[PDB]
Structure 1
Amino acid sequence: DCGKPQVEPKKCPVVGGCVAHPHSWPWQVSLRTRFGMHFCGGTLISPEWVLTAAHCLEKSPRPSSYKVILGAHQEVNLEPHVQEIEVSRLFLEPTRKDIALLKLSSPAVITDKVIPACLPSPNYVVADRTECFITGWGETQGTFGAGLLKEAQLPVIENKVCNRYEFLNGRVQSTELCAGHLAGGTDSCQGDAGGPLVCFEKDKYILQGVTSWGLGCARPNKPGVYVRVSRFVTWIEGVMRNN
């Protein structure tokens, strides 16, 4: 059952936002070096497959350089039941987009704390103002929560508006989407890249974005940019089917 957490998440009362109800985001992964250091996020989309950002793998083209942590809440004191799995193969998106697939050495064990997120239908366009969630262990820029999994509820901004001069001035492609509060203060940041942007649809969470880049973090009029997952579903499915 993809997209359905067992520990229901909570809204807030990653820069800003709040600490996540522990294990309320069971698809969240921590992408780490062979040495145990968190540097990027990821999303479990199937027991053997993690979706992250291509730029997170810029340092090494070697699957051995990476490990995936599943089911955690703490970044340092990993809980005992935490699943730590090596990566066997890396798949960079073939058109140089900032998205990539990780095939794990062993299929993650599905538990109340480790659950895959659902994928959207091809070419779905998250509507303007849709409130979605981003999560990760990234920088907090003095906002509390360092070391614990944080979340933020952000409104999507349609590309036509996001590309205006007042915002990102034509930098955003159709294969990306924008999200964030234009007054600033709450945003994903370095360390959250490759992590999920999920939207609640009917009764479950759908992976709609991959945290990619931005002009800084939580700055006014500077929403974050995310890879538009719906434009890569067909490629993702082909990779999982043929590998």
Structure 2
Amino acid sequence: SFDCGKPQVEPKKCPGAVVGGCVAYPHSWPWQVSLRTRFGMHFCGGTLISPEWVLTAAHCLEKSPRPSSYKVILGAHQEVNLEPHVQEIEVSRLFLEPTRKDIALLKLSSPAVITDKVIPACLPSPNYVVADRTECFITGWGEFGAGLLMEAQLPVIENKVCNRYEFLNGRVQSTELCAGHLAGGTDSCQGDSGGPLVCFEKDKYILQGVTSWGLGCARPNKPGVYVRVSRFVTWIEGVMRNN
């Protein structure tokens, strides 16, 4: 329950060839956040990147500018009947990324207790470019909702290829990345808007992508598009240290 990116429960690691993905082993994605309204309704995902900081998608915040309207559920596995020791914390502040405005930082009113069920994802070094065909996972509750936390393994597709004429045709910005399959492939729509796309780097998981509604999920004849986290690291750190 220490270093970022190292679950204390080892991930199942759903093979890429499973349709619909797999149910995660409980607490194997300890940074996984469930975003809810004050009335406790799950509508988005997010990633714990510090005891006091959650990274999510700006689109998740469209229905309200008031930081008190949002609750962050950490340590969860079930979507509805929440586990006994799940941490439920009010957001004190919102910081919308200013250039692209696709992601946001939520500051938690009280810090999260770091345990072996609740651990931060590691951030990539600035401007890092995840290589073509790197295997990553997306996790979340697919929000019928999944009910239990799901995972799916998706390969990254370099922007140059993903932007080809016959595929996404120039619409993927350098501040985004693609993952999934170009043609064929299973529908991998297991994440929540705002949820994580992490990739294992020899001994820990690094958050490389943030899923977005208005972008997409990995579909059979179209990959998913994720905000490229490495391009917002210095900003993220700046917000954290100065706030």
TM-score range, shorter chain: over 0.9
Deviation at 1:4, TM superposition (A): 0.4
Please tell me whether the aligned partners of residues 122 and 232 of structure 1 are also in contact (alpha carbons under 8 angstroms): yes
Cα distance between partner residues in 2 of 1:227 and 1:215: 9
Deviation at 1:184, TM superposition (A): 4.8
Please tell me whether the aligned partners of residues 138 and 188 of structure 1 are also in contact (alpha carbons under 8 angstroms): no
In structure 2, relative to structure 1, the CA distance for the partners of 1:64 and 1:184 (3 Å cut) is farther
Deviation at 1:20, TM superposition (A): 0.6
**1:5 corresponds to:** 7
In structure 2, relative to structure 1, the CA distance for the partners of 1:66 and 1:186 (3 Å cut) is farther
Please tell me whether the aligned partners of residues 213 and 226 of structure 1 are also in contact (alpha carbons under 8 angstroms): no
In structure 2, relative to structure 1, the CA distance for the partners of 1:68 and 1:215 (3 Å cut) is closer
**2:30 corresponds to:** 26
In structure 2, relative to structure 1, the CA distance for the partners of 1:74 and 1:176 (3 Å cut) is same
Please tell me whether the aligned partners of residues 43 and 52 of structure 1 are also in contact (alpha carbons under 8 angstroms): yes
In structure 2, relative to structure 1, the CA distance for the partners of 1:183 and 1:19 (3 Å cut) is farther
Please tell me whether the aligned partners of residues 88 and 105 of structure 1 are also in contact (alpha carbons under 8 angstroms): yes
For these two proteins, the number of residue pairs brought into alignment is 239
**2:224 corresponds to:** 224
Deviation at 1:220, TM superposition (A): 2.8
Deviation at 1:138, TM superposition (A): 1.1
Higher mean C-alpha deviation, range 144-153 or range 107-116: 144-153
Aligned partner of residue 212 in structure 2, secondary structure: strand
Higher mean C-alpha deviation, range 1-10 or range 206-215: 206-215
Deviation at 1:216, TM superposition (A): 5.6
Please tell me whether the aligned partners of residues 136 and 149 of structure 1 are also in contact (alpha carbons under 8 angstroms): yes
Please tell me whether the aligned partners of residues 214 and 223 of structure 1 are also in contact (alpha carbons under 8 angstroms): no
| Fraction of identical pairs, as percent | 99
Aligned partner of residue 173 in structure 1, secondary structure: coil
Cα distance between partner residues in 1 of 2:191 and 2:208: 19
Please tell me whether the aligned partners of residues 179 and 218 of structure 2 are also in contact (alpha carbons under 8 angstroms): no
Matched, 1:111 2:115: yes
In structure 2, relative to structure 1, the CA distance for the partners of 1:145 and 1:90 (3 Å cut) is closer
* TM-score normalised per structure 2: 0.93
Cα distance between partner residues in 2 of 1:185 and 1:129: 14
Higher mean C-alpha deviation, range 176-185 or range 192-201: 176-185
Higher mean C-alpha deviation, range 13-22 or range 3-12: 13-22
In structure 2, relative to structure 1, the CA distance for the partners of 1:98 and 1:203 (3 Å cut) is same
Unaligned runs of 5+ in 2: none
Please tell me whether the aligned partners of residues 118 and 206 of structure 1 are also in contact (alpha carbons under 8 angstroms): yes
In structure 2, relative to structure 1, the CA distance for the partners of 1:86 and 1:131 (3 Å cut) is same
Cα distance between partner residues in 1 of 2:155 and 2:40: 33
Cα distance between partner residues in 1 of 2:61 and 2:225: 18
Runs (4+) off by over 6 Å: none
Aligned partner of residue 11 in structure 1, secondary structure: coil
Cα distance between partner residues in 2 of 1:8 and 1:183: 31
Please tell me whether the aligned partners of residues 166 and 221 of structure 1 are also in contact (alpha carbons under 8 angstroms): no
Cα distance between partner residues in 2 of 1:44 and 1:201: 18
Cα distance between partner residues in 2 of 1:36 and 1:15: 30
Cα distance between partner residues in 2 of 1:176 and 1:127: 13
Deviation at 1:55, TM superposition (A): 0.7
Deviation at 1:101, TM superposition (A): 0.2
Aligned partner of residue 161 in structure 1, secondary structure: helix
Please tell me whether the aligned partners of residues 167 and 223 of structure 1 are also in contact (alpha carbons under 8 angstroms): no
Cα distance between partner residues in 1 of 2:184 and 2:56: 25
Aligned partner of residue 42 in structure 1, secondary structure: strand
In structure 2, relative to structure 1, the CA distance for the partners of 1:228 and 1:66 (3 Å cut) is same
Aligned partner of residue 154 in structure 1, secondary structure: strand
Deviation at 1:221, TM superposition (A): 2.7
Aligned partner of residue 39 in structure 1, secondary structure: strand
**2:72 corresponds to:** 68
